[PDB]
Ligand binder design. Structure first.
Ligand SMILES: FC(F)(F)c1nccc(N[C@H]2CC[C@@H](Nc3ccnc(C(F)(F)F)n3)CC2)n1
Lengths: 368, 357
C-alpha cells in the first residue's frame, strides 16, 4: 500500500498542577518520536500542554491530514474512559475534571475522517478507568465506515496503565520498525506484553480495529500543492538557533549552544571557551527570560542537563557546561530575548552582562 | 497452544413476535455449527429463543465451561449497542424494548471469566446502533484483565449489519474459520476479504476488538482427559445433549406398517418423518401448527434440510419449551380412521432441562 504522507502528533503530559505528576511520557514521547522519524513520519512531539494548547495542537494537526495521508496520534498522560469514550487530561485541568476540561479522542477521530485519511492510528497510553465526576455522557452521531481506524490502548477498559519506559512503549519500541500490517504488529506487541512476568493479570494491551487493507507504518510515501504548505510549515517547525560566541570586556569568551528535546522543549547551554590566565573564578549564567515561558529560575543554570528535567543526559550534549531547559516554547508569543551574565574573580566579584536575541526557536517559529 | 475443551453456544433469532423477521440466522447457525464441529468444538446451536430461554441457554453453556476452556458465543439476530455494551434481543421482546428485555454480552463475558476460561470469542452478527428507548446507564463492574478476549463484530459501531443464502459476515467467515491461525489474525484477514470484495467494500466493515495476548487459535488441540468430580459432571451433561430418538416401526390393527424417523437439524430443532399416515396431538408447549406439519417435502416445513439429505415431514423447532416427555399420535386414514400414541422421551436439548435455571 501507498501513503500520501505520514504525519504524527505525540503528546506527553506529566506536570499537572492539580493532579499527581507522571514520569514515563518524557522517555516514551522521545523514543516514539525517533522511531516514527525512522519510518519517514513528520512528527510533532509536545510536552505538558494546557487544554487551550492541546485543542490548538489537535485542530492544527487536522488541518494537515489530507486524503490518503496516514495520521498517527499518540497520547501519554492522565486519561479516563467513560461509557466507551476516551478522554485526555491537559496539565492545567482542575480537580476534579469533567469532559469539558478534557479532549475526547472520539471527537478527534471524526474530524480526521472529514480529511479522507488513508490510515488513522491512535495509541492511547493512559488509564481507562471511569471518572465518577462526569455528569454528561456524550452521545455522538458516531461512525463513518472508512475501514481504516486502528486503536492501540496500553491497557483494558476499567484497568490502569503502569529514566525508564512505561510498559506499553517498552514492548512497542521493540517492533514498531517491523514491516507488518499495523494490526498484526500491535497484536504481536500484546503477545510480548503477555510473556512479561510483570503485566500478568494487571496490564494487557487492547486493540480495536476496523482496518480492511494491508496498511503498515512502513508504507512508502508517494506531490500536491497543499502538501507543500505542510512540508514548508514542517521544515520551519524545527529550526534551532546557531551556536554563538560572546566576547566579554575582560577577555572571557563564552559559547552559547542549543539542543532540541521536543518540538516545544529546548536545552540552552553555556561553556567558557577561553579564559585569560589572570582570571581564576569564572561563572556564566542565563537570566531575563520572557515571562510567557514561565521558566523556573532555579531549574536553570544546572551543572548537568538531568537536573533541569531533561531526557538528555550529560554525555548526550557538549560536555562541562551549565544547562537550562525551556520546556514551554508554545507559550512564546514574542522573540526569545534573554541576558547572559558573567561573574569573575582575579576581593570583589566582577559582573558584566550581554543581551542575546535568538528569534523564535523550534515550534515558536510557527506563529500561532 | 492447548485447550482444556472447546465449547460453543450459537443463537440464531429470526421469528420475532413484535419486530421484523430475519432470514440469514438459519443458514449461518447451521453452517457455523458444522465448521466448529470440524474443529472438535462441543456445539449447542439454538434458534428463536425468548429472553427466558436465552438466559437458560447461557447458564447451560456456562456449566460446560471450566479453567482453560475455549468458550465461543456466536449470535445472529436483532441487537443494539448502548454506552459501549452490546445487547441481544430475544424473539419475545416488546416494541419498544429496554435492557431488561435483552441479554448484555458483557454480562455473559463476566460470567465466563469467573469460569477461568482460556479463550473467550464473541462473534456478534447484529446491528450496532443505539436503542433510543433504553435510558439505562451501565453501572458497571470493571471486568478482570484476563488477556484472552476476542470480539468479532459483523459491522462497525453505529452502523447496520444488513442482509442480502448466507449473511455477509458468515459468507466471509466460512472461507477462513478452518485455518491454523491465531483467532485475532484470522479475524483480521476476514476483515481484509470484506474490504477487497467490490459489493461489500464501503457498505460493511468488520470490527475486531481484542486483548488476546497468547497464540490461541480455534484449531488448537484439546488436552487429554481431566480426572475430577467437575469433568465427570460436564461430560455426562454433554453426553445427554444431542440424543436422537431411534427409528421405530409401528404396526396397525389393519396390517399397515409405518416407519417413524427422526433427524437433528439444530440442538432444539428435529424433523419427524413417516414412511408407509400423519402425526398430530403434539404437546401444547411446542406450539406445532398442524397447518405446517406433514409436508410432502422438508423444504415446506422451513427446514435447512432438503429432500436429498433424508414420506411426510414435520419440523419440531421449539424443543427447548418441552417441559415433559414428547408424546404424539400417529394417525392412519384408509379406504377408516385409527390411531397409535408414541413416546420418544426428551429429544436433543430437551433432555438437558434448561428450564432449571
Ligand atoms: F500545542 C500548541 F503548541 F499549543 C500548538 N499551538 C498552536 C498550534 C499547534 N499546532 C500543532 C503543532 C504544530 C503542527 N504543525 C505542523 C505542520 C506541518 N506538519 C505537521 C505534522 F508534523 F503534523 F505533520 N505539523 C500542527 C499541530 N500547537
Amino acid at each position: 500500500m501507498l501513503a500520501k504522507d505520514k504525519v504524527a502528533l505525540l503528546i506527553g503530559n506529566m506536570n499537572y498542577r492539580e493532579h499527581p505528576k507522571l514520569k514515563a511520557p518524557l522517555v516514551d514521547v522521545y523514543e516514539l518520536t525517533n522511531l516514527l522519524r525512522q519510518l519517514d513520519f513528520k512528527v510533532v512531539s509536545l510536552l505538558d500542554l494546557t487544554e487551550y494548547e492541546m485543542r490548538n495542537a489537535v485542530d492544527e494537526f487536522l488541518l494537515l491530514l489530507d486524503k490518503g495521508v496516514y495520521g498517527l496520534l499518540y497520547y501519554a498522560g492522565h486519561g479516563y474512559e467513560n461509557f466507551g469514550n476516551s478522554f485526555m487530561v491537559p496539565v492545567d485541568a482542575p480537580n476534579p475534571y469533567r469532559s469539558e476540561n478534557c479532549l475526547c479522542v472520539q471527537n478527534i477521530l471524526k474530524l480526521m475522517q472529514e480529511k479522507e485519511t488513508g490510515l488513522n492510528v491512535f495509541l492511547l497510553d493512559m488509564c481507562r478507568k471511569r471518572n465518577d465526576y462526569d455528569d454528561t455522557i456524550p452521545i455522538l452521531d458516531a461512525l463513518k465506515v472508512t475501514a481504516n481506524i486502528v486503536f492501540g490502548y496500553a491497557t483494558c477498559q476499567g484497568a490502569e496503565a503502569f529514566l525508564a519506559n512505561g510498559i506499553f512503549m517498552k514492548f512497542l519500541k521493540d517492533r514498531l520498525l517491523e514491516d507488518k500490517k499495523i494490526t498484526v504488529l500491535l497484536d504481536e506487541v500484546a503477545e510480548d506484553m503477555g510473556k512479561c512476568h510483570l503485566t500478568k493479570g494487571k496490564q494487557a494491551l487492547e486493540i480495536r480495529s476496523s482496518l480492511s487493507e494491508k496498511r503498515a507504518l512502513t508504507d512508502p510515501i508517494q506531490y500536491s500543492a497543499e502538501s507543500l504548505v505542510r512540508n514548508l510549515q514542517w521544515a520551519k517547525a524545527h529550526e534551532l538557533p546557531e551556536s554563538m560566541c560572546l566576547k566579554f570586556k575582560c577577555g572571557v569568551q563564552i559559547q552559547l549552544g542549543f539542543a532540541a528535546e521536543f518540538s516545544n522543549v529546548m536545552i540552552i547551554y553555556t561553556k567558557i571557551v577561553y579564559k585569560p590566565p589572570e582570571i581564576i573564578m569564572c561563572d556564566a549564567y542565563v537570566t531575563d527570560f520572557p515571562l510567557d515561558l514561565d521558566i523556573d529560575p532555579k531549574d536553570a543554570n544546572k551543572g548537568t542537563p538531568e537536573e533541569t528535567g531533561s531526557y538528555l543526559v550529560s554525555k548526550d550534549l557538549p560536555k562541562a557546561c551549565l544547562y537550562t531547559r525551556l520546556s514551554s516554547l508554545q507559550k512564546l508569543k514574542e522573540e526569545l530575548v534573554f541576558t547572559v551574565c558573567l561573574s569573575y574573580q582575579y576581593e570583589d566579584t566582577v559582573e558584566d552582562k550581554q543581551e542575546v536575541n535568538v528569534g523564535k526557536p523550534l515550534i515558536a517559529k510557527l506563529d500561532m
